[PDB]
């Protein structure tokens, strides 16, 4: 696979067969949801909170424990970010390369990967427009991503 | 393992357009479609033609053979192109004449040269109405 290269990596997370909570875990849905929400209050994202809960606590997966996914919980508490994670980070990476491109103008390997980041943002956008997670009339141009990230 | 060509059920457009394009490389198709028979081809894409013989000619055979091929150069009544037709038996150049009328036909090879004869693509079958076979076998005599 790896749509934007010849890479064929199979690095992934083979989630456990057990569709129920780990038998060694206590303080169920109530306490973990509170710890998810207060982490999202601090400003971390579902992709980071799932890590912090897997690392520091015994929350193996969020959806098996609770019956609710992490950003599905944030949308339950109305504490979701404006644009989703996938698009946010890809836009941030397009602004990252483009902010260096204008200084270093012969970086044709940078300009190449900028096109790659940008033409992956557009493929996300078309999806998020179809499924209505983003409003229509939405497109990332340039010098407006500066407004989107900050 | 896809065999190149598309194998969608909704690919009839592509599968037809791809043949429409790639059919041109065929010889018969291309010349039937562009109408080469009706632009080139002294016969204007027809079976026979008629003409008035300008000259008697001695065309030299191609290299492995050696002979004088007793052709006749003839202007086509039909359009006005001047072609060179072969006289198709032993002592028939003496039968045709200069300034006489001649029914031509292809040489049995569809716009190519028959054997050793260079640049002759046609053949005399009749002179002044009576066939170049009957006069040869001494069955019919020329008119007048």
């Amino acid at each position: 696979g790896r749509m934007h290269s010849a890479g064929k990596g199979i690095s992934s997370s083979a989630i456990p067969y057990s569709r129920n909570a780990p038998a060694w875990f206590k303080l169920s849905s109530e306490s973990v949801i509170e710890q998810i929400v207060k982490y999202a209050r601090k400003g971390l994202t579902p992709s980071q909170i799932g890590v912090l809960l897997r690392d520091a606590h015994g929350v193996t997966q969020a959806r098996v424990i609770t019956g609710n996914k992490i950003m599905r919980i944030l949308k339950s508490n109305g504490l979701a970010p404006e644009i989703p994670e996938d698009l946010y980070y890809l836009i941030k990476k397009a602004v990252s390369v483009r902010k260096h491109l204008e200084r270093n103008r012969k970086d044709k390997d940078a300009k190449f990967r900028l096109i790659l980041i940008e033409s992956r943002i557009h493929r996300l956008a078309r999806y998020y427009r179809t499924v209505a997670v983003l409003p229509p009339n939405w497109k990332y141009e340039s010098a407006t991503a500066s407004a989107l990230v900050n | 393992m896809g065999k190149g060509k598309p194998r969608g059920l909704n690919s009839a457009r592509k599968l037809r357009v791809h043949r429409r394009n790639n059919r041109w490389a065929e010889n018969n198709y291309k010349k039937r479609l562009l109408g080469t028979a009706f632009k080139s081809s002294p016969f204007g894409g027809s079976s026979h033609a008629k003409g008035i013989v300008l000259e008697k000619l001695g065309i030299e055979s191609k290299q492995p053979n050696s002979a004088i091929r007793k052709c006749v150069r003839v202007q086509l009544i039909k359009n006005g192109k001047k072609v060179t037709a072969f006289v198709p038996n032993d002592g028939c150049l003496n039968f045709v004449d200069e300034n006489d009328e001649v029914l031509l036909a292809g040489f049995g090879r569809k716009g190519k040269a028959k054997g050793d004869i260079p640049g002759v693509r046609f053949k005399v079958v009749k002179v002044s109405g009576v066939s170049l076979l009957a006069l040869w076998k001494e069955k019919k005599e020329k008119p007048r």
Binding site: Y17, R19 | R7, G8, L9
Partner: protein, 129 residues
């Protein structure tokens, strides 16, 4: 992406039965795959097959008897009519006696022999000799 799952399942079974192996592992395992295997099983081209239910598409482990010679899919599911089944079972199979062309008919996944006895048609899935 992999465009079809019956394709690589039937291929995998063929690639194994080429070498005269006695079992295959099919990774994707759809309901359409299982139903095709069931029609193979009925006429006796296949032994038994387990369905391991990994919380996903799951997998199958089929057991062969070395009877199956050819076992293929027709990729684009051509809209076949019972008026022209004979044109398929004359073009795909060894003459007339044995072998079966598999239709995904409205009545369900069947062979040409069964579809004739019912007097029904549908699309084409594949074949087994």
């Amino acid at each position: 992406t992999r465009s079809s799952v019956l394709a690589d399942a039937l291929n995998a079974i063929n690639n194994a039965e080429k070498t005269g192996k006695r079992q295959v592992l099919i990774r994707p395992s759809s309901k359409v795959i299982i139903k095709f295997l069931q029609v193979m099983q009925k006429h006796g081209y296949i032994g038994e097959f387990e369905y391991i239910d990994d919380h996903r598409s799951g997998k199958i482990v089929v057991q062969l008897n070395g009877r199956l010679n050819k076992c293929g899919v027709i990729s684009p599911r051509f809209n076949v009519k019972i008026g022209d089944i004979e044109k398929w079972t004359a073009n795909l199979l060894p003459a007339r006696q044995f072998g079966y062309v598999i239709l995904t008919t409205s009545a369900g996944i069947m062979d040409h022999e069964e579809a004739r006895r019912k007097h029904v048609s549908g699309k084409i899935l594949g074949f087994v000799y």
